Amino acid sequence: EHLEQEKHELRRRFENREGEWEGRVSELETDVKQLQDELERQQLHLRE
Amino acid sequence: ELAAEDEQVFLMKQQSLLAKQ
Amino acid sequence: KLSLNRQFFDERWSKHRVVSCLDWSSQYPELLVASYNNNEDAPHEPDGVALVWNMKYKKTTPEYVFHCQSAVMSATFAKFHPNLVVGGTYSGQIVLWDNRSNKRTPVQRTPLSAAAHTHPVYCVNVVGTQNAHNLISISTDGKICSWSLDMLSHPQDSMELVHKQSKAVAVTSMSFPVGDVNNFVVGSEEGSVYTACRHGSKAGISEMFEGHQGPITGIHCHAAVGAVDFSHLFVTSSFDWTVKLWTTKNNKPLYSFEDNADYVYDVMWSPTHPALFACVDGMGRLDLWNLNNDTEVPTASISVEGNPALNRVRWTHSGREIAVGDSEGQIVIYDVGEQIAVPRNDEWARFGRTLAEI
């Protein structure tokens, strides 16, 4: 029973940190996308 | 005559079990 | 112009409750079923209540009463089972009431198992032919389940609705085109409508719309059918005070109305007039917009006495009357003027030209 409880808590912390990793990856990709948009805008301003 | 424990008596038994813990 | 015709209010049952839903029976167009959630003022009373009133008689008493342990978030008539009234509750049990039975408790209620619904159900409908009919219900978890009215032990079909990256769609409202049974439209709390397919290769959510920036309050498809088909059109109300007129083909707004200085809580087409539609807000205003006459200002407007916050609105089948339920468990019926409600033969072409213009 103690092994079973430990296994369940490991699955739980596993999934929680996995969701955290997905959120971090999505936020960094959002930063990359926004900053690329700003680079496009600045190049357009350069040509203007 | 085996008879199912009533809800009240079985739950008083479970109260006794939980309380001592 | 709107004329106050009839007001329904039961002191014992409807008092201190919100009106959760409304519907008119097809075979009995003079019959109106309304829902009521739990009353905080009366915890001992039944939480869910559902009252059916009548218009042919002038008696104020509710023609039929029903109640249940769970608060009724939605209700409707069974189109092909005239004795039956279907309801979806807060806990997710699809309750059913038979008017023949003297019992007020639901004769049937679905399990709330993993197979069945497991969240509040805000939209239920019976769609199909007289030969074939299916009870589609959706919960706030995105689970959509088809049931048979004859058996509510286990659904006909069941799945969960997602659109991208397996993100659950908290569905808040739903509608169908006229005559269609496989393809439907759902307005979630995202502010994003989804055209979805019930069954087939592409079953699930087919399209996204960005649209509203707040929760959608109601979604309703075009009901009037005539010379020019407009079933591809639909309307969406939201918490953002805005009412958006859309079509299936375009992915972006065809038009958005923002005259309302309050949360617009429901929107609905007329069943006869193609351009006309109605909406109701929480400030206490019911507004009729006739896009043939104007896509600019309410064609008609009316405020219920005391300005109670209007929650639900339902057009009658004939299109000559509108019923509205407020946050006080009080129903108001307004007869529409014949000039507005009755469509002229050119109203269809007028709405076609208006849609071409935008």
């Binding site: - | 809800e7 009240q8 939980l18 | 919100v18 707040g214 929760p215 916050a309």
Partner: protein, 241 residues
Amino acid sequence: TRITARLRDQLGTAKNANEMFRIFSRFNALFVRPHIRGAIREYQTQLIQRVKDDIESLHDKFKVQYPQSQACKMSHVRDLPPVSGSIIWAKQIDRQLTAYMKRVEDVLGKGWENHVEGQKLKQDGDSFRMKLNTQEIFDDWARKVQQRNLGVSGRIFTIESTRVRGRTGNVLKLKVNFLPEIITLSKEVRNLKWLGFRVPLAIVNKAHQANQLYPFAISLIESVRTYERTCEKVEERNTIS
């Protein structure tokens, strides 16, 4: 010059700020010509007064606090938890304030803020905008939730006591080990993530797990309810006991 007569025609009908914007919205080609802009400048000083009233009225709606407002009552109807409900109610007001400010830019053109009238209205809008901050509400909830330390834990079942009419002893009814607030955190965290607030990862865990425990939790109370509902049948007829 004919349009100038129409500019007389259209404003005399319209008294509300919104009304003037619609007819003003129609005149899209004439924002290039500084002949109609002067005829707009005839009316400009009025339109800042009109939109000031809408923002005033919008501020008046904000004066009534969210719990007092009808929105809180009917948000409660529509399974919207309170803290998220207050945030959403505030967010819409801020957006409609922004919507009015965009009309002013259309009415007064670009660089309107430099106008003496423009400075005053902009100051009025900014102060109201500050009052509509929604970060203050979300942060307090994260602190308060962490103070409460929600977690189902305990046991799968934790029996509670209920007084039943017609029985002198308290009737113990089997209950799934659960608290009413735990429902709200599932909805609050779900709402807040869409709103854009970065919920604490700890509270994120406590909320989803209760959400993931909800199907099993309601699955169990069916067994409790069915086993209960079966028992009254046995109570009805002592013979089959």
